[PDB]
Design a protein around this ligand. Structure first.
Ligand SMILES: [K+]
Ligand SMILES: [K+]
Ligand SMILES: [K+]
Ligand SMILES: [K+]
Ligand SMILES: [K+]
Ligand SMILES: [K+]
Ligand SMILES: [K+]
Ligand SMILES: [Mg+2]
Ligand SMILES: [Mg+2]
Ligand SMILES: [Mg+2]
Ligand SMILES: [Mg+2]
Ligand SMILES: [Mg+2]
Ligand SMILES: [Mg+2]
Ligand SMILES: [Mg+2]
Ligand SMILES: [Mg+2]
Ligand SMILES: [Mg+2]
Ligand SMILES: [Mg+2]
Ligand SMILES: [Mg+2]
Ligand SMILES: [Mg+2]
Ligand SMILES: [Mg+2]
Ligand SMILES: [Mg+2]
Ligand SMILES: [Mg+2]
Ligand SMILES: [Mg+2]
Ligand SMILES: [Mg+2]
Ligand SMILES: [Mg+2]
Ligand SMILES: [Mg+2]
Ligand SMILES: [Mg+2]
Ligand SMILES: [Mg+2]
Ligand SMILES: [Mg+2]
Ligand SMILES: [Mg+2]
Ligand SMILES: [Mg+2]
Ligand SMILES: [Mg+2]
Ligand SMILES: [Mg+2]
Ligand SMILES: [Mg+2]
Ligand SMILES: [Mg+2]
Ligand SMILES: [Mg+2]
Ligand SMILES: [Mg+2]
Ligand SMILES: [Mg+2]
Ligand SMILES: [Mg+2]
Ligand SMILES: [Mg+2]
Ligand SMILES: [Mg+2]
Ligand SMILES: [Mg+2]
Ligand SMILES: [Mg+2]
Ligand SMILES: [Mg+2]
Ligand SMILES: [Mg+2]
Ligand SMILES: [Mg+2]
Ligand SMILES: [Mg+2]
Ligand SMILES: [Mg+2]
Ligand SMILES: [Mg+2]
Ligand SMILES: [Mg+2]
Ligand SMILES: [Mg+2]
Ligand SMILES: [Mg+2]
Ligand SMILES: [Mg+2]
Ligand SMILES: [Mg+2]
Ligand SMILES: [Mg+2]
Ligand SMILES: [Mg+2]
Ligand SMILES: [Mg+2]
Ligand SMILES: [Mg+2]
Ligand SMILES: [Mg+2]
Ligand SMILES: [Mg+2]
Ligand SMILES: [Mg+2]
Ligand SMILES: [Mg+2]
Ligand SMILES: [Mg+2]
Ligand SMILES: [Mg+2]
Ligand SMILES: [Mg+2]
Ligand SMILES: [Mg+2]
Ligand SMILES: [Mg+2]
Ligand SMILES: [Mg+2]
Ligand SMILES: [Mg+2]
Ligand SMILES: [Mg+2]
Ligand SMILES: [Mg+2]
Ligand SMILES: [Mg+2]
Ligand SMILES: [Mg+2]
Ligand SMILES: [Mg+2]
Ligand SMILES: [Mg+2]
Ligand SMILES: [Mg+2]
Ligand SMILES: [Mg+2]
Ligand SMILES: [Mg+2]
Ligand SMILES: [Mg+2]
Ligand SMILES: [Mg+2]
Ligand SMILES: [Mg+2]
Ligand SMILES: [Mg+2]
Ligand SMILES: [Mg+2]
Ligand SMILES: [Mg+2]
Ligand SMILES: [Mg+2]
Ligand SMILES: [Mg+2]
Ligand SMILES: [Mg+2]
Ligand SMILES: [Mg+2]
Ligand SMILES: [Mg+2]
Ligand SMILES: [Mg+2]
Ligand SMILES: [Mg+2]
Lengths: 206, 134, 263
RNA sequence: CGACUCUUAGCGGUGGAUCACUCGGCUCGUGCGUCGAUGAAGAACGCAGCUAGCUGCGAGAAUUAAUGUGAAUUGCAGGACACAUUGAUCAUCGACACUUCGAACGCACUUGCGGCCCCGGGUUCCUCCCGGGGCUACGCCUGUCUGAGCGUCGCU
RNA sequence: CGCGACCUCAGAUCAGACGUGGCGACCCGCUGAAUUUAAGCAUAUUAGUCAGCGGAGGAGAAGAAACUAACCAGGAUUCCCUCAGUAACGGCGAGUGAACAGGGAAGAGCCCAGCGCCGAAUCCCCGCCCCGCGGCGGGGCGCGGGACAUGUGGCGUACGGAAGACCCGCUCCCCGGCGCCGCUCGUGGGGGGCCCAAGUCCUUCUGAUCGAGGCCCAGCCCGUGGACGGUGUGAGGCCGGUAGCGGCCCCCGGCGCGCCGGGCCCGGGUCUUCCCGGAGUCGGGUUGCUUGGGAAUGCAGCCCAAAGCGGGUGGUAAACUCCAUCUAAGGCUAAAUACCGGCACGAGACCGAUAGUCAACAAGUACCGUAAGGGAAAGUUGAAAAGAACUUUGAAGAGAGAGUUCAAGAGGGCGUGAAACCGUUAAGAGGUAAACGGGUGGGGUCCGCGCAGUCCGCCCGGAGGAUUCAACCCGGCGGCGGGUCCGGCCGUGUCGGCGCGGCGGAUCUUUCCCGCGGGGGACCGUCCCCCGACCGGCGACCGGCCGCCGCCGGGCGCAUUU
RNA sequence: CCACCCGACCCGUCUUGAAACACGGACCAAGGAGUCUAACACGUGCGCGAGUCGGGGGCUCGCACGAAAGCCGCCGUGGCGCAAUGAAGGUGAAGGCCGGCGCGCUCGCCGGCCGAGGUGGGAUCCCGAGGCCUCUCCAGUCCGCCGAGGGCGCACCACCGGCCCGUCUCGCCCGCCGCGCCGGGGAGGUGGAGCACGAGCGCACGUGUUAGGACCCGAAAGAUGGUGAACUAUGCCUGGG
RNA sequence: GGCGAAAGACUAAUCGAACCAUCUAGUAGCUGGUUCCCUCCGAAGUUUCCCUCAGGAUAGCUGGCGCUCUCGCAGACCCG
RNA sequence: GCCCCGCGGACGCUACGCCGCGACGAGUAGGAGGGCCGCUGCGGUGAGCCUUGAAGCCUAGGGCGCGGGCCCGGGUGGAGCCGCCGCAGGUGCAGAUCUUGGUGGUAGUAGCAAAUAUUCAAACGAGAACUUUGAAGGCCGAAGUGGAGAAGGGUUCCAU
């Protein structure tokens, strides 16, 4: 029964909710268990990076997030092809590969191609046989530099280009931003009915 | 403070394990201090009490300097009977009175092959801990 | 309580007309249990009223800023001898508050060394007070692994542990806190400010980095500065006695006018 | 004057509150996460010197072997080769053992009735009788053997 | 006629294997209510939930797009936060209700059929020998058997693939037994066993003590051990234990290098040419269920029934057109996730015998019901049985003495022992049932224990005694004052300047460096340090010095004083 | 404990009305009923503040306490708040004076200044003629209180005006890569949970409201799956009288 | 559902729908109960709407929390 | 000259404290405040209490508080317990034909009345209306109060 002024509420408690209640008393225990597994995995895979293989830069979709980049699932086959890395070899040396991803633009492709090349320079490759090295990193390089890289490999950061202050030209001062948007919307809205009418008069005249 | 996560501090648990301990564990529970001369001789502080061990009662109504022999180790009752530690029942029968082994001091040990092996284990370990403390 | 408690029975009400209360009653016969009330909070063997649930809200959130403020107030009160003594910390022979000792204490390895140092700094009387407080708890807590209760002693605060914890852990009443991770539950036991704390030099020097000053922010916290006083001068006596206040006041009226008996 | 009745106190009963105790619950958490035709889960019956229940065990029956341990077990008794150090007891448990019913398996569920093979006995030399051992369930897979078909063909 | 081959079938206690049933907390596939809410009730809700059936594993299922999107695009599955009580559904009522993007936990990818090419290059069984060798097998052999061209294996799968030519770079990988043993494997690989500090000192309390006091010099002693339990209270030091990258022994496993029993062994690039895909399935209609999915989200039945520049999707039915995006109708796959059953284990602001599980006990027991099923009550002597010898009355139950014990005023359902109710004793009372409020009176019990009952301060008088008072001197301390006493310092401000000082900055950088951006610099802000002048003030903190005052100790003061 | 005088019916409950010939209650002990979770509202306390908040995750050689605590900042993703309005496409909160003009709308272009309008009330604050007085007179200084009267006016209230969005009536003017079935502007009304120099966020407590067993006890009923023909009903078989 | 020479009879003391367990602590505008003390304030049975008339929503009546202001003085004393 | 024959002059002000003046005081349903009212457990604290006697319980003992309640004495008891500052809740009973356990008045009452019937003597025995033996009087009356079975019971059979 409502009483005086209040919000109309519809609590979703008409089923046997008490039978399905997930408590979180094992949350501290879960965090401990995940931590120990991370540490155990890192010791097992040393000196390979603890977080995992390197991931590519990808741009988040939709208008809400296209201004930001993040780590992708894996490098595309085109990116690996340009970088000169066989897709089968990439996984063994710590490069994630995503055959599903396609590069729509060349800016994204070059960003990840550069990321792969810069990763390859940073990579220290131990010989399969310690006594015999063929094309692996130098003994000196392996002996000292090799250490387990903690945290994401080459974290993906949103870079912002600084734009220095400048004198406003006459053209910029005369640019009508509001009217440009208003007409651009109408041009897109009426483009078809204009193509229909313009076409319709064409056979009318001819 | 206890730090082992696999060792319990529970009062109910420790009492349960104590009062339901099997006999061979009850042997360890029924340890008694050695006398000063024995402690100095063997470098051992305590031994599990055995029948045919001479002891002194150092606590209770029968406390004194008399050296008596342990005639029965009743592990099920956690008590020992000593040869002169007795009392007079109503009808005149003489019954031993149970004394907890932690309240007696061994003055003479019944040495055989097993006790000598046990004694040299405790003394080797006590000495090894000195090589720690130092 | 168990969710099944009080309901592991097929009891059913006899209804009216049988000269008994309409509570559910156990079915069957041939035993004492048959015909007895069930399911009720008022019935022997029934379910308590509103059985306790595990999804009670046990835990509480406190804002990080409010948690940090409490550490600042606790630390500030630990430097006031009136407030430390008010916590019964026996510091009458302590040379100074706050009590700071050289960093080689962090390297102590033996409990004898820790005991001797507490004697030299005249903090041992607090440990002896802890010993005198060792007693048995009153009530059901004795059956629930809380038999012995004692009092809180000095709180040793260190920066880097090179053995200090092992050396002091066996002394009753001693709480050891890393300065980087300060605990309000340890610094203000019982919710009362003014626990006697002993600092090492390194831990003491780090406090301006952990909590900052009013002129520079903390360097070991992303965004924290010390809280602001809403009363810079707390000495109420000096303010009232000050000539600025006195010249503004009216003359006090002290003549007590009592009831006049009307004749 | 007593009874009787009531009230209050002392003491005695009747009753089992209260307090103290707790080898039991409840809740949370952790690690592991393993049953069975090589007979499970469950059930029945039996097993101790005295023992009915509980417990343990299976005709080797309140346990065998082994390993660890190191002098008990115990309510009473008995055994100095059954009172043991040449190993009591306890623990572990990897060896051996493990009755009947039970998915339950010859059939049937009455300790009802068979069949096949082998061994011993009845002087067995046949039949037959007794005892003992092995086997004899349904479905299904691969393979083997024996076959069926006016199914499709080949040769004569 | 018959003899053979195959096909389709059948029998066997044929040789060798496999399934059944259980548990079921969590998981998968079905089936599936009504109570209830809607203030009635039928759609709705309850709920794809309970009950019912089937199938598993330590996880299960899911899973590498016939995906999301519409962006500068993301990129298997699962889980968490958020999206969000939202879009949507709904007698548009009650009510119901996802997803994508984003941030995380985890992260792993792959295999067939087809299409081709390779002399079936393939597999199972059997027999023998040799070697590792509880059957796990490796190889060799066999004019041994069978499967199999109605298609086994190698290569290859949508990320393309194959062959040929030309170029470039090469000799790898794996499994089982070497030995020695490298190895926080993470709290020191795992499992089992056996050990490891220090008071029973002195005095006393007590039935017993673990109580109390003491144990020179900070010292009873150990403490990496002051968790816990036991022991006649209440124990770090009596005992087990506890702490310890403590010891010893035994067993088990992965890794690390070390001959072999052995197998296995080419790759990448470019060019030319060839090859390229899952059908009573998709899709359509209709029906029923389902969903937030709304002119139909998913599923199924029936009918219709494909295509190959096709097909699916693109959240409003339809036609045309462009574009985007994937490639269905075959299959495998760890992790992150779940776990009221089980095997071990730890803990708790929980309960404390009418509570907590029904069950602290010979509890799913006794008992009840034909049965399915229902289902209790019930803990405590004492430190130790020392469980009351013996005498005496009685047929005995039961008493009276005696005895044990600190206690039987603990005597075997025995700690404590309430109330209701009863017996007895003492006191009081009693014909308007009792009881009750207010007021007094009488009696009784006990208390004050009263029962000679104000002390405190000052002054006066008598009668004593003294470490004797004031003042002054010498030490020590303290309070207050002196910042135009001196250090120390502090508050703030200006100038120059220090540490390339630190940190930040949506300031600038063709000084300059290199791979088209990061560096490194300048500036600004801030802080920190230092350095001269200079700066108000010293309960912010602070010493020395001086002045005053006060106290204390010592000296003198030796009596009209104190 | 008893006596006497005055007063004095049995409580709980429902009820207009209970001592009731209304119901429950023989007696005593122990147990016995507004809880907890989610949501929402307001009020109060605390922190920070145009922000606020890590709750999920991670780091700290996990682990008596500690399953705590501390930290993160290119972990603030995200929530709520800072912007409303419309069904939606969408649009989206600043004006007043000083001039120089044009136009005659009552407006429009330019430079300036200022910077969230105005009116009535308004805690507080500011100024304040005049006053009060010392042993007296001459004029002064420090220097409080009284003060008519005036001024700046917090918050808040009311009223007028203004700004944004929807909608309507009216009427002209302007823009250009889109000369368009294009885009923008004014004025007068009216609809909005808007603006008009922010007040929120997190945490805690209380009270109320609700969904939940929902303060406790209580139906007649409904559903699912099972157990019963040892009584009895009926058929059959085989016996007895 | 059975069974009924029919009485809604009988179907294990149960029959106009057996018994057992579960759903299920089913719902109840209805009946009963709802546990310490003192202090201060203190009602309503009326309005409107409701398949409403033993119930609610609504306004009234209540309490709690406030907040916005108004009103002080000749005076340590006495004294406009 | 401010001080000085005298060197001194009560209490106060837990400011959440203390003090003064005036007016007021009914209360169901209901609201709010205070509680040094009460229960259980947790963090602090009381150099708290306790085998020289804790909790509990009893009390014609002594008192305090308007009250909720509390303190103390005595008795009993035999191992634990409490104050204060905060925290937390399964926190306060007279009722619910409340739940479970116990106990009364009724009350030494109703009742121990269906089917004809017992008596004498002896034995054993502590004890005899009731057992046994003997004697007498009776009944069942062969459709039995007789002798044997089925079902069901499950040792009830027999001896001591
Ligand atoms: K043995
Ligand atoms: K269909
Ligand atoms: K009496
Ligand atoms: K009533
Ligand atoms: K009545
Ligand atoms: K509620
Ligand atoms: K019979
Ligand atoms: Mg990760
Ligand atoms: Mg427990
Ligand atoms: Mg339940
Ligand atoms: Mg009655
Ligand atoms: Mg219960
Ligand atoms: Mg208590
Ligand atoms: Mg405490
Ligand atoms: Mg009594
Ligand atoms: Mg009794
Ligand atoms: Mg053996
Ligand atoms: Mg038969
Ligand atoms: Mg066979
Ligand atoms: Mg199965
Ligand atoms: Mg479990
Ligand atoms: Mg309804
Ligand atoms: Mg209803
Ligand atoms: Mg209805
Ligand atoms: Mg459904
Ligand atoms: Mg189910
Ligand atoms: Mg399994
Ligand atoms: Mg998995
Ligand atoms: Mg694919
Ligand atoms: Mg996804
Ligand atoms: Mg939201
Ligand atoms: Mg629909
Ligand atoms: Mg639904
Ligand atoms: Mg997402
Ligand atoms: Mg093939
Ligand atoms: Mg020891
Ligand atoms: Mg003890
Ligand atoms: Mg101890
Ligand atoms: Mg000691
Ligand atoms: Mg250890
Ligand atoms: Mg397409
Ligand atoms: Mg389209
Ligand atoms: Mg596969
Ligand atoms: Mg009890
Ligand atoms: Mg119980
Ligand atoms: Mg029970
Ligand atoms: Mg006693
Ligand atoms: Mg006696
Ligand atoms: Mg007594
Ligand atoms: Mg007693
Ligand atoms: Mg008793
Ligand atoms: Mg009276
Ligand atoms: Mg200061
Ligand atoms: Mg009436
Ligand atoms: Mg009444
Ligand atoms: Mg009447
Ligand atoms: Mg009634
Ligand atoms: Mg009655
Ligand atoms: Mg009670
Ligand atoms: Mg608030
Ligand atoms: Mg924050
Ligand atoms: Mg813990
Ligand atoms: Mg944390
Ligand atoms: Mg934000
Ligand atoms: Mg954001
Ligand atoms: Mg105004
Ligand atoms: Mg226009
Ligand atoms: Mg408008
Ligand atoms: Mg409200
Ligand atoms: Mg009910
Ligand atoms: Mg119905
Ligand atoms: Mg029959
Ligand atoms: Mg008939
Ligand atoms: Mg009729
Ligand atoms: Mg039945
Ligand atoms: Mg209820
Ligand atoms: Mg009604
Ligand atoms: Mg209507
Ligand atoms: Mg009516
Ligand atoms: Mg009524
Ligand atoms: Mg009143
Ligand atoms: Mg008194
Ligand atoms: Mg509780
Ligand atoms: Mg309660
Ligand atoms: Mg009661
Ligand atoms: Mg009441
Ligand atoms: Mg009679
Ligand atoms: Mg009679
Ligand atoms: Mg007759
Ligand atoms: Mg006759
Ligand atoms: Mg006849």
């Amino acid at each position: 029964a409502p009483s005086r002024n209040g919000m109309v509420l519809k609590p979703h408690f008409h089923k046997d909710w008490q039978r399905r209640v997930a408590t979180w008393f094992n949350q501290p225990a879960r965090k401990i268990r995940r931590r120990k597994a991370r540490q155990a995995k890192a010791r097992r895979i040393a000196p390979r990076p603890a977080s995992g293989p390197i991931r590519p830069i990808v741009r988040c979709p939709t208008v809400r997030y296209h201004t930001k980049v993040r780590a992708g699932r894996g490098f595309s086959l085109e990116e690996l092809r340009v970088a000169g890395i066989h897709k089968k070899v990439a996984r063994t040396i710590g490069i994630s590969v995503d055959p599903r991803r396609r590069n729509k633009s060349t800016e994204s492709l070059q960003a990840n191609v550069q990321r792969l090349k810069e990763y390859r320079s940073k990579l220290i490759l131990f010989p399969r046989k310690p006594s015999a090295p063929k094309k692996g990193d130098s003994s000196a390089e392996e002996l000292k530099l090799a250490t387990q890289l903690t945290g994401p490999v080459m974290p993906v950061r949103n870079v912002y280009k600084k734009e220095k202050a400048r004198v406003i030209t006459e053209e910029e001062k005369n640019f009508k931003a509001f009217a440009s948007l208003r007409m651009a919307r109408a041009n897109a809205r009426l483009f078809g009915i204009r193509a229909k009418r313009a076409k319709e008069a064409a056979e009318q005249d001819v | 403070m206890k730090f082992n996560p696999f060792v319990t501090s529970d009062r109910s648990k420790n009492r349960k394990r104590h009062f339901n301990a099997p006999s061979h564990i009850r042997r360890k529970i029924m340890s008694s201090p050695l006398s000063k001369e024995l402690r100095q001789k063997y470098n051992v502080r305590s031994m599990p009490i055995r029948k045919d061990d001479e002891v002194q009662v150092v606590r209770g109504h029968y406390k004194g300097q008399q050296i008596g022999k342990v005639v029965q180790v009743y592990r099920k009752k956690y008590v020992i009977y000593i040869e002169r530690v007795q009392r007079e029942k109503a009808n005149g029968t003489t019954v031993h009175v149970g004394i907890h082994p932690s309240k007696v001091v061994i003055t003479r040990l019944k040495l055989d092959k097993d006790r000598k092996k046990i004694l040299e284990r405790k003394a080797k370990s006590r000495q090894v801990g000195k090589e720690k403390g130092k | 309580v168990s969710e099944l408690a009080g309901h592991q029975t097929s009891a059913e009400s006899w209804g009216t007309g049988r000269a008994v209360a309409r509570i559910p009653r156990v079915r069957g016969g041939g035993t004492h249990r048959s015909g007895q009330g069930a399911f009720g909070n008022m019935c022997r063997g029934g379910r308590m009223f509103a059985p306790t649930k595990t999804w009670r809200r046990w835990h509480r959130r406190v804002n990080t800023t409010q948690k940090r403020y409490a550490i600042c107030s606790a630390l500030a009160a630990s430097a006031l001898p009136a407030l430390v003594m008010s916590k019964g910390h026996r510091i009458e022979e302590v040379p100074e508050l706050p009590l700071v000792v050289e960093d080689k204490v962090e390297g102590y390895k033996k409990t004898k060394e820790a005991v001797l140092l507490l004697k030299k700094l005249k903090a041992w009387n607090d440990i002896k007070k802890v010993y005198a407080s060792q007693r048995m708890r009153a009530g059901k807590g004795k059956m629930r692994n809380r038999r012995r209760i004692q009092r809180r002693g000095p709180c040793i605060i260190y920066n880097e542990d090179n053995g200090i914890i092992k050396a002091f852990r066996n002394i009753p009443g001693i709480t050891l806190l890393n300065v980087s991770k300060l605990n309000i539950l340890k610094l203000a036991p019982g919710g009362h400010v003014g626990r006697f704390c002993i600092w090492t030099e390194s831990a003491f020097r780090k406090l301006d980095e952990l909590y900052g000053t009013w002129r520079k922010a903390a360097s070991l916290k992303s965004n924290y500065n010390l809280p602001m006083h809403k009363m810079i001068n707390t000495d109420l006596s000096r303010i009232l006695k000050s000539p600025e206040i006195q010249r503004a006041l009216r003359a006090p009226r002290k003549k007590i006018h009592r009831r006049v008996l009307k004749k």
